[PDB]
Design a protein around this nucleic acid. Sequence first.
DNA 1: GCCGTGCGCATTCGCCGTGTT
DNA 2: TTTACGTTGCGCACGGC
RNA 3: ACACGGCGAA
Length: 828
Amino acid sequence: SDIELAAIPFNTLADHYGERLAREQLALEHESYEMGEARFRKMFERQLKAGEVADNAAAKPLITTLLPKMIARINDWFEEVKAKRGKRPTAFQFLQEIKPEAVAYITIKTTLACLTSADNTTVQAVASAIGRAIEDEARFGRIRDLEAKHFKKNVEEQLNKRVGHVYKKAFMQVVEADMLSKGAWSSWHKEDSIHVGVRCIEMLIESTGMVSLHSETIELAPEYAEAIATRAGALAGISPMFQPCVVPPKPWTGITGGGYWANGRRPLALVRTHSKKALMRYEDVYMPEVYKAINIAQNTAWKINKKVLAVANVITKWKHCPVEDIPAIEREELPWKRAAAAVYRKDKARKSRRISLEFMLEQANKFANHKAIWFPYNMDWRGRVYAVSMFNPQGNDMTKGLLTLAKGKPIGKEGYYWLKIHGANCAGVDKVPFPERIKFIEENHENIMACAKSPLENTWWAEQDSPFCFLAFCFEYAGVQHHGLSYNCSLPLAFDGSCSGIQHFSAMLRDEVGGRAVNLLPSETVQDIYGIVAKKVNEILQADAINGTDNEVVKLGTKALAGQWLAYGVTRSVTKRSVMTLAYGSKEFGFRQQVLEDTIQPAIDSGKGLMFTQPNQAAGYMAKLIWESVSVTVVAAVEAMNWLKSAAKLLAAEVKDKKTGEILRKRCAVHWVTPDGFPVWQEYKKPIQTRLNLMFLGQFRLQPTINTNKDSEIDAHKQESGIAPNFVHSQDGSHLRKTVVWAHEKYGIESFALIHDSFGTIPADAANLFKAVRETMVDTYESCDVLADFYDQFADQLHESQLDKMPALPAKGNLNLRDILESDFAFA
DNA sequence: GCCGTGCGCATTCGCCGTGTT
DNA sequence: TTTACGTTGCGCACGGC
RNA sequence: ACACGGCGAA
Ligand SMILES: [Mg+2]
Ligand SMILES: [Mg+2]
């Protein structure tokens, strides 16, 4: 903790926590590096052990160093073969069919995809591959033109959507069948390929230096191999599989080096900037209140919940797990193919959803028994707080259920009450006033005690929404029964804001209309903006049901389209995403994809949607009802969004003198400071090396031709589409930080379970976390005009030169912010 | 400079393992 | 060396009036 | 900075 104690790690740790743990920490931090390095190797090996080195980061810096030098030979060759007054070296014509440097990549990316694939490879081998590779790309690739504007025809849906070595060529080979423009292709036989490759390989040794020698055999040079290899070693040690700490995290006292104690070559950064320049920007920023939050949060002690671990260890192995959606051990034995071949899709998810489950579970068992564990914390560039280790209090239900707070306290009267509210919430009974939630729990007393007594026999808990967190609650609840209000409880009891995006919008705009929808006002009943939008959608569907157009040709009209959804079960869930993203910039076309993928696509997979006859239409239709319904509800917000977008737009713009063509104001990055003093710099940038996508072999970049470069170029588009969510998210993250500091400094709360818009503590402190999250909400927006502050941030610094078509600050509303203090259902 | 025919882009952020049968 | 189909609407770009 | 599957999240 001492600014001086930021010396030799082991000494400071032991001095504070004893040599034993001091060792465990460092041993642990070191293991994370080791594990990370392994994970890299395994991959980097399976990469070359399957001819695909060029892809790996390790070879990228080599490729870029040579890829360009090829034209300095390839083309330097053509404009030289043209000097000969006779026949052309055969290769000439059999390489002019595609982009030069595109060949060079297909060349190198293949000369190595063999020099690292097999152990005994010669010129015939390479050439028979290079030339072989020059084709395909020459074939299915020369279709770049005389097909453009029609290639992106999405007739291939994300073209080679399903990745695959030969797959990209499989589900795209007989697809070549279609006559389309012209047609027919005279295969390069099987005697030109070698020749094609031979010159490639020769003008490779002629340009680069890779392929060296003393029929012969090809071998990667000594310095170009020891390079990719060095690059690896010097790359495997930077993606550690960070793990929790067995001692409190190293407090942050600067933009880097907090969290973990071992002082390494690559310490941890406070903000997750992509560029050192971004990070370096915080290098001197005064933000005491921000460091305070991150430190307070990360000093929260957690322990593994031995009982939840107990059931989770076994039950996740059960052939048929009683837990709703837990990835099962094995597959589903062969997918007719028909529409029931989606398995390749569903099992893909399962196997990956399963990987993390076993990792989370292994971490839990690895850390059971420890008196406590901690999670270092840092932030993304908007300032939201994230635990650094893969396993953390912000994970899924099972993860959250495996974790509980280490420092509990006698639960008490209030603690018990909130514990019951939490349990009701974990069960899903949460869109109802508190009295009805308590009743839910009390009138389920025996069920809860049962699941507590014998979880693997009384699995009523697995049936709930947050089964493991609910089970976690049953144990604690059963505990209160066996011991009374004196029971020491440390269960993190979660309070979550209801649609915080809109809440923040309503607060900063004082919008009472919106506020009401998102419980920013005291109310007997619990407002649910998604359910609201859902009702409106139903009035529509109901209306379109009896009288709303019919089918033409084949295209399902309304009425029949509405009936389908009516047949379904349009609920708050279907409208969620869209209501939440609207004010972020999600348009009707967004909704379509959302409804499609979020509720239709999946419903179909399990077979509970055998009444949609083409997800589309069903989706576009739903997307429209939601838009027209969500629009008549979220307005101030949309106004506020558009105001932000205008700001981003005018700052991203590049202003040129109407007459001289001179740049008057260079594109600018949107910048703002959150209420707790966290500065955010939004500056997306259009890629530097305009990459060329060569189907099959993959994609690669290249140093620009035009000497532009300079900074990198701001992405005016991204800058405008992100400003709304980035702004609001930084606003919630600030509220999160302010609440952590407030609850700690005003109520002495030490334990926090923070999940962005979710605030948690032990039952005994629940009541105070409850007022605190509300108090900070009010102090903030009653003390700051974030939009007007934002404006004072760009109005001057970067602007004018004609730019003054800046819409006016949205009109404030009549929402009395202090009412939030008396709102039962606001939570956040 | 001022309105058509075209093209591009769908909200944003975190992070991981696989690249097949 | 045997899963994979598919639409719907605002600014930014030329650029001939 | 482009890919697929996941999850977290607004
Ligand atoms: Mg929420
Ligand atoms: Mg969420």
